[PDB]
Design a protein around this nucleic acid. Structure first.
Ligand SMILES: [Mg+2]
Ligand SMILES: [Mg+2]
Ligand SMILES: [Mg+2]
Ligand SMILES: [Mg+2]
Ligand SMILES: [Mg+2]
Ligand SMILES: [Mg+2]
Ligand SMILES: [Mg+2]
Ligand SMILES: [Mg+2]
Ligand SMILES: [Mg+2]
Ligand SMILES: [Mg+2]
Ligand SMILES: [Mg+2]
Ligand SMILES: [Mg+2]
Ligand SMILES: [Mg+2]
Ligand SMILES: [Mg+2]
Ligand SMILES: [Mg+2]
Ligand SMILES: [Mg+2]
Ligand SMILES: [Mg+2]
Ligand SMILES: [Mg+2]
Ligand SMILES: [Mg+2]
Ligand SMILES: [Mg+2]
Ligand SMILES: [Mg+2]
Ligand SMILES: [Mg+2]
Ligand SMILES: [Mg+2]
Ligand SMILES: [Mg+2]
Ligand SMILES: [Mg+2]
Ligand SMILES: [Mg+2]
Ligand SMILES: [Mg+2]
Ligand SMILES: [Mg+2]
Ligand SMILES: [Mg+2]
Ligand SMILES: [Mg+2]
Ligand SMILES: [Mg+2]
Ligand SMILES: [Mg+2]
Ligand SMILES: [Mg+2]
Ligand SMILES: [Mg+2]
Ligand SMILES: [Mg+2]
Ligand SMILES: [Mg+2]
Ligand SMILES: [Mg+2]
Ligand SMILES: [Mg+2]
Ligand SMILES: [Mg+2]
Ligand SMILES: [Mg+2]
Ligand SMILES: [Mg+2]
Ligand SMILES: [Mg+2]
Ligand SMILES: [Mg+2]
Ligand SMILES: [Mg+2]
Ligand SMILES: [Mg+2]
Ligand SMILES: [Mg+2]
Ligand SMILES: [Mg+2]
Ligand SMILES: [Mg+2]
Ligand SMILES: [Mg+2]
Ligand SMILES: [Mg+2]
Ligand SMILES: [Mg+2]
Lengths: 211, 58, 159, 145, 296, 169
RNA sequence: GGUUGCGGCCAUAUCUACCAGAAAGCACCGUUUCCCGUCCGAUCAACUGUAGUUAAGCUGGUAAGAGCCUGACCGAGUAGUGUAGUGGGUGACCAUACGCGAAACUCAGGUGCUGCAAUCU
RNA sequence: GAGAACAGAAAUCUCCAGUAGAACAAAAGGGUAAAAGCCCCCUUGAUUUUGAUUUUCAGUGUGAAUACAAACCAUGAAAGU
RNA sequence: AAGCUCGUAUCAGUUUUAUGAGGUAAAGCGAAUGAUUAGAGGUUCCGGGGUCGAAAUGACCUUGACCUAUUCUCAAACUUUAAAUAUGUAAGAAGUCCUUGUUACUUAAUUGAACGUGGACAUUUGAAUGAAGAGCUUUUAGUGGGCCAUUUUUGGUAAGC
């Protein structure tokens, strides 16, 4: 009863969220977006590889969920479940309608059918962090997930240090200085702005210079 | 038996044949709806100054 | 069915400006209007009484009547292929003196000056406005400023 | 459409002069798809007027052919010969409005060489024919005059 | 403050501050709006107010008009001027209120020309009466009471002000039911009472009664009255004489001054902390990551 | 530093929560009257609870605010009933404090079987001079930090004059 | 320059934490016969200016402070957009031509100005 | 939030924070803080006359509304409303 | 269709300059409302379990919510900001300045307000471009099924819908 994905590939509609105006919309088929060793510290996994869209289209909750499994299944069984951090960068917030069927074309407003993510050119879909000594496994995993999606996506080796917004050197520079400090699975950076007093609290290991 | 419901198609073609007539403007417009207390007085004021030109032609 | 009441579609129009709610400052009330003045029209949502219809929002007209709490503004609205005169009864909160006239009024006084000012010397004036002219010639030096050569740049990803 | 009219271009291949200021620049901007233009040299202004130069006189589009026609109508502004007329145009003198309105829109033929392009209705810059082509306007006009 | 109190940047960012003069709790804009604004067809005609404020024991009376650059004092009188007219004590009582307002009406009325015509009530039996307009002649000077934030209790002394500004000559529109001597349960004023207050009859009777029942207190407060020898009875004659003094010459003498503006300026900057330079401030921080960082 | 950041009592508010209208309430009322000499004030229920048996606006409880000397008496008086021992709670961090007693008779006042026995909430609220700022009409303001009643300040205050105890931790 | 009464613009004025304030002013502050309001003279009313105090208010200064304000070829001529083509592409969409052109970001600089009247070492 | 006998998740008392996160018959959207909300006091302007005006428009009607004139009143110390 | 009153005149599906209005596109979400992935650190006399317990307003784990600083993602009926294209008014003789008359309106007031008398300054008189002129009046036909293309765009899987 799922219509072929062909029927909702394109963005022909303004976004139709779940809302007080909508209300009875089916649960999203994808529901975990963070797999693998997601507790992992930022220094642990420096290499970042992305799965990136090349089309303005729509991806189903279903195709994200399938793709998710595929990439994650490959990744762990080849290189272990704590070798990587998989992140789905895309949430399926757009409801699709269906005119299920006495009447005819009269009064044809549809009912919620399923969910989709609306996605740009260059929009990042999957993101992965690991150790460089794993690129190919990770890459191969994103390659296998590709087959689960409509339209062309292309995998891209990042310049950034894991899920961070800093290039590897600039991150190294901020770190082997004092400016960086660990947090959940991300990180916090000393600012030159704000109270001096409780800027020294946090980041004690700064406020020197040398070694 | 359904039909076209509504359209502006061709309406500004029509408005522009004879033109969108600019508003036309007069010196001495009407006092239509101007404060009646003012007007009542303004009336006697004018009576007065008129008198004083008939007077200045004695 | 459809809905077309007086203040329809006006949700954001009559809204109040970020962090500018509440009393209206007294200067609004201290300003003075005279028949013949030009005013711009814009509704204060907090003043429901004597309020312009949404059509007249952002419209500029001439004052024709001065009353205890209000002014009468005539606006020419175009309906069909023609204008009709419209007279609005606006409260002073929904009106302000227009500047659409200052660059003229200030230019008139100015004109009168350099007119008499010049004349007294021995004429040669030119006081019509003129459009941006094109640029005249000019020589640009290189001293401390040899031209930097740029090329286009290769394609790259950073992401 | 209104701008082509205000510039007096109401038929294909006709042409007129335009003194350049911001207040006309923007008119030119608005009609780039339908016109070609550029900076005329003395030679081509001279030959436009000598050959297809007509005054407007009680309307009535009148050929220049003799200087008394010019002086009767523009003598008021100085300007009492055909080469005066030209001098007023090319220097964009103090009476360019009167001088230039006096000239009827020039009525040109199709270029004799041809257009140099497979398709007219792209900009000069894209191997097409419209827009400001600057000094290359002269070769066109001459081939059309 | 408390921690689980304390403000988020979001709260602060969206906060719309009231008019300054409300934050100060000094101006009621709702009242001001309706006091100040004028008939739009009376054009540039100012709308004067009789502002009456009480400090901890100075009375302030100004006649004020409005301007979008700010207000405009026409005239001012303070009850601290009353020693000039023979009133040294109790400069905040109901009759110091009356006197000052009388001073303010006489002063302005004077500097306006209406000094002679429109004398007000000279007799003063505290009868209820506002000042009528001279047949063929200028309308009286009209002024509206700005109570400010005062509560309107019947007996409030802000209306004492009102009484002698009206008894002074001014047309200050007013009803009678907040004057001392208005009987709650009959729409009627006893003026024997209201007269009594105008002349300070309540303060004196307090003095007479305190005399023979408790001179412990009578000496504590009323110290000045003993010290300058004034037992009660005289009080009415004091203010009666004051009244007359004021009409004789309300024309406002300023203080002799001593020391210049420039002078007051100088000695006041001796006590004024000066803002720092941003270069300086950068070397308090640099100084701070010397000590608080560089390990002692 | 202290000149007159002396620690007066703002007010004592005695409160009887008699969760019901009718006689038993007008009696609790009568207690608070003769206890304060002031004619006491009544409270209506905020909403309806039904397993407390009350209805919205029922008149459910009486109380009374008492200020100056008269307040110190009743305080001190009930303070005896509490054997001059409170607890480290009872003292709000804004610096006020209260206690309860059952049976009003343990503070003068005879018994009388026609008025019965009533429990009572004592609540002392402390402040200093210059508090008028917060409460007055014009130029309403807020008492500066080092002028605010706090728990410490009030406990030490309480522990000194009265010479009572605090207990617990 | 301070302060006050009345203001204009209504955060460069607000918020958090500290410290400093001469003189006058303001203030806190004392009282309850009178007018007046309260459950309560706390608010409100009156009376004293006497008995007391800068503690608070108030004003000002401090802070790699939170907020706000201003600027900048900081980002960005980026996003978006008016106009053109028998331009590319199965398409989704995309490039080019003549123009208009943001927001976030980032960094720097600020933190009430001012009218009328009175008063003051 | 922190406090007070019975008293509990919820009864009534107090202080602190509090830009409105409430409330204003009702749909929703606008608006509003010494108010437009809550408590109290006095009321009938929800009245009288007959015109002009804005929306819908044909620039007809109806509905609704706006600002004045001419009465008579209400409230307030008052400007006012 | 008939004209009629006028004629450099006044006119404009245009630009420029000056001064307004607007909440779409973009953008935003470590900004409000509303959604949404992940951890990290806090907080309970107070949501439930569990160990020690005679209990505790006890201690220790525990999982919940709440809080703090962070993190991935979104909005036709969200939003601080905020375009481009469109859009109101203005660019003078019906103008500007001087003197000082009229009234029953209005001012404390010969104050103002409104309408005026008398006086002073002309085509660079107040931006551009154009104008086979402009203004005006009467009367009457047909029509009142529409369809298509680019762009914006709703419903619909879609349609030569
Ligand atoms: Mg589209
Ligand atoms: Mg659709
Ligand atoms: Mg069907
Ligand atoms: Mg059928
Ligand atoms: Mg239906
Ligand atoms: Mg339906
Ligand atoms: Mg988007
Ligand atoms: Mg694919
Ligand atoms: Mg970021
Ligand atoms: Mg049909
Ligand atoms: Mg059909
Ligand atoms: Mg039809
Ligand atoms: Mg609708
Ligand atoms: Mg109404
Ligand atoms: Mg031309
Ligand atoms: Mg040839
Ligand atoms: Mg050939
Ligand atoms: Mg050849
Ligand atoms: Mg071809
Ligand atoms: Mg040829
Ligand atoms: Mg908080
Ligand atoms: Mg923050
Ligand atoms: Mg406010
Ligand atoms: Mg009031
Ligand atoms: Mg002290
Ligand atoms: Mg019960
Ligand atoms: Mg103060
Ligand atoms: Mg002192
Ligand atoms: Mg007292
Ligand atoms: Mg008082
Ligand atoms: Mg101090
Ligand atoms: Mg800061
Ligand atoms: Mg575009
Ligand atoms: Mg195309
Ligand atoms: Mg692009
Ligand atoms: Mg509502
Ligand atoms: Mg108010
Ligand atoms: Mg009715
Ligand atoms: Mg009809
Ligand atoms: Mg109608
Ligand atoms: Mg809209
Ligand atoms: Mg939007
Ligand atoms: Mg959008
Ligand atoms: Mg944004
Ligand atoms: Mg949000
Ligand atoms: Mg336009
Ligand atoms: Mg011409
Ligand atoms: Mg002609
Ligand atoms: Mg017909
Ligand atoms: Mg017909
Ligand atoms: Mg018909």
């Amino acid at each position: 009863a799922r219509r072929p994905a062909r029927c909702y590939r394109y963005q022909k509609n303004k976004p139709y969220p779940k809302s007080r105006y909508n209300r009875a919309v089916p649960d999203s088929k994808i529901r975990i977006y963070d797999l693998g060793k997601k507790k992992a510290t930022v220094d642990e996994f420096p290499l970042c590889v992305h799965l990136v869209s090349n089309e303005l289209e729509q991806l189903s909750s279903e195709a994200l969920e399938a793709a998710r499994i595929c990439a994650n299944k490959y990744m762990t069984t080849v290189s272990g479940r704590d070798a990587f951090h998989l992140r789905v960068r895309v949430h399926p917030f757009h409801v699709l309608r269906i005119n299920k069927m006495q009447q005819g074309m009269r009064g044809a407003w549809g009912k919620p059918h399923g969910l989709a993510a609306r996605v740009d050119i260059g929009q990042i879909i999957f993101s992965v962090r690991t150790k460089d000594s794993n690129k190919d496994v990770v890459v191969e995993g994103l390659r296998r997930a590709r087959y689960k999606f409509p339209g062309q996506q292309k995998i891209i080796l990042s310049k950034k240090w894991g899920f961070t917004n800093l290039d590897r050197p600039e991150y190294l520079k901020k770190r082997e200085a004092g400016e960086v400090k660990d947090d959940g699975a991300f990180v916090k950076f000393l600012s030159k702005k704000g109270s001096l007093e409780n800027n020294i609290r946090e980041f004690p290991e700064y406020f020197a210079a040398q070694a | 038996a359904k039909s076209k419901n509504h359209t502006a198609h061709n309406q500004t073609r029509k408005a522009h044949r004879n033109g969108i007539k600019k508003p036309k403007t007069y010196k001495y417009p009407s006092l239509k709806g101007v404060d009646p207390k003012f007007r009542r007085n303004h009336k006697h004021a004018l009576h007065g100054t008129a008198k004083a030109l008939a007077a200045a032609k004695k | 069915g459809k809905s077309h009441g007086y203040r329809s579609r006006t949700r954001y129009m009559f809204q109040r400006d970020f962090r500018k709610h509440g009393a209206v400052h007294l200067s609004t009330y201290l300003k003075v209007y005279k028949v013949g003045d030009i005013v711009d029209i814009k509704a204060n949502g907090s003043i429901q009484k004597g309020m312009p219809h949404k059509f007249y929002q952002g419209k500029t007209g001439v004052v024709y009547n001065v009353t205890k709490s209000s002014v009468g503004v005539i606006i020419n609205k175009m309906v069909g292929n023609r204008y009709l005169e419209k007279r609005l009864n606006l409260r002073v909160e929904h009106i302000k003196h227009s500047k659409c006239r200052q660059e003229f009024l200030e230019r008139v006084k100015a004109n009168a000056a350099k007119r008499a000012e010049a004349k007294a010397q021995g004429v040669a004036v030119q006081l019509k406005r003129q459009p941006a002219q094109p640029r005249e010639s000019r020589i640009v030096s290189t001293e401390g400023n040899v031209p930097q050569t740029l090329a286009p740049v290769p394609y790259e990803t950073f992401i | 459409r209104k701008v082509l009219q205000l510039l007096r271009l109401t038929r294909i291949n006709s042409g007129t002069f335009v003194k350049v200021t911001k207040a006309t620049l923007e008119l030119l901007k608005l009609i780039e798809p339908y016109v070609a233009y550029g900076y005329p040299s003395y030679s081509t202004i001279r030959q436009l007027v000598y050959k297809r130069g007509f005054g407007k006189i009680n309307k009535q589009r009148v050929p220049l052919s003799d200087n008394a026609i010019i002086e009767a109508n523009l003598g008021k502004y100085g300007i009492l010969s055909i080469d005066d007329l030209i001098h007023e145009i090319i220097t964009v003198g103090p009476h360019f409005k009167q001088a230039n309105n006096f000239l009827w829109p020039f009525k040109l033929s199709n270029p004799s060489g041809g257009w140099g392009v497979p398709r007219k209705f792209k900009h000069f810059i894209q191997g097409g024919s419209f827009g400001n082509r600057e000094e290359f306007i002269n070769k066109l006009v001459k081939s059309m005059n | 403050a408390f921690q689980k109190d304390a403000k988020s940047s979001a709260y602060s960012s969206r906060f719309q501050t009231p008019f300054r003069r409300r934050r100060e709790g000094k101006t009621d804009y709702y009242q001001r709006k309706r006091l100040v604004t004028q008939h739009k067809a009376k054009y540039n005609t100012p709308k004067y107010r009789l502002v009456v404020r009480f400090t901890n024991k100075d009375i302030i009376c100004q006649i004020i008009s409005s301007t979008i650059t700010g207000d405009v004092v026409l005239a001012a009188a303070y009850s601290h001027e009353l020693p000039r007219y023979g009133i040294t004590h109790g400069l905040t009582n109901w009759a110091a209120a009356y006197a000052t307002g009388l001073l303010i009406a006489r002063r302005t009325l004077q500097k306006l020309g209406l000094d002679e015509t429109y004398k007000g009530v000279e007799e003063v039996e505290g009868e209820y009466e506002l000042t009528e307009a001279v047949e063929d002649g200028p309308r009286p000077f009209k002024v509206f009471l700005d109570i400010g934030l005062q509560r309107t209790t019947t007996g409030a002394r802000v209306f004492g002000a009102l009484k002698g500004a009206s008894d002074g000559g001014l047309y200050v529109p007013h009803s009678e039911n907040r004057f001392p001597g208005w009987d709650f349960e009959t729409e009627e004023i006893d003026p024997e009472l209201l007269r009594s207050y105008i002349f300070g009859g309540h303060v004196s009777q307090y003095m007479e009664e305190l005399a023979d029942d408790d001179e412990e207190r009578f000496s504590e407060l009323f110290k000045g009255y003993l010290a300058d020898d004034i037992d009660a009875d005289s009080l009415e004659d004091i203010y009666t004489s004051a009244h007359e003094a004021i009409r004789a010459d309300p024309a406002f003498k300023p203080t002799e001054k001593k020391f210049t503006k420039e002078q007051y300026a100088a000695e006041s900057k001796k006590y004024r902390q000066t803002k720092l330079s941003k270069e300086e401030r950068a070397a308090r921080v640099a100084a701070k990551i010397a000590a608080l960082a560089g390990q002692q | 530093q202290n000149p007159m950041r002396d620690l007066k009592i703002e007010k004592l508010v005695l409160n009887i929560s008699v969760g019901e209208s009718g006689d038993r309430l007008t009696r609790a009322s009568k207690v608070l009257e003769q206890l304060s000499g002031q004619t006491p004030v009544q409270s209506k229920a905020r909403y309806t609870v039904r397993t407390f048996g009350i209805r919205r606006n029922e008149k459910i409880a009486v109380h009374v605010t008492v200020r100056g000397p008269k307040a110190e008496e009743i305080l001190e008086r009930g303070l005896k009933v509490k054997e001059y021992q409170l607890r480290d709670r009872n003292f709000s961090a804004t610096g006020n404090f209260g206690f309860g007693i059952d049976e009003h008779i343990d503070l003068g006042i005879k018994y009388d079987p026609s008025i019965g026995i009533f429990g009572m909430d004592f609540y002392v609220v402390m402040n200093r001079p210059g508090a008028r700022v917060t409460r007055r009409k014009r130029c309403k303001g807020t008492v500066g930090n080092s002028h605010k009643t706090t728990k410490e300040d009030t406990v030490s205050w309480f522990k000194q004059k009265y010479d009572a105890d605090v207990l617990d931790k």
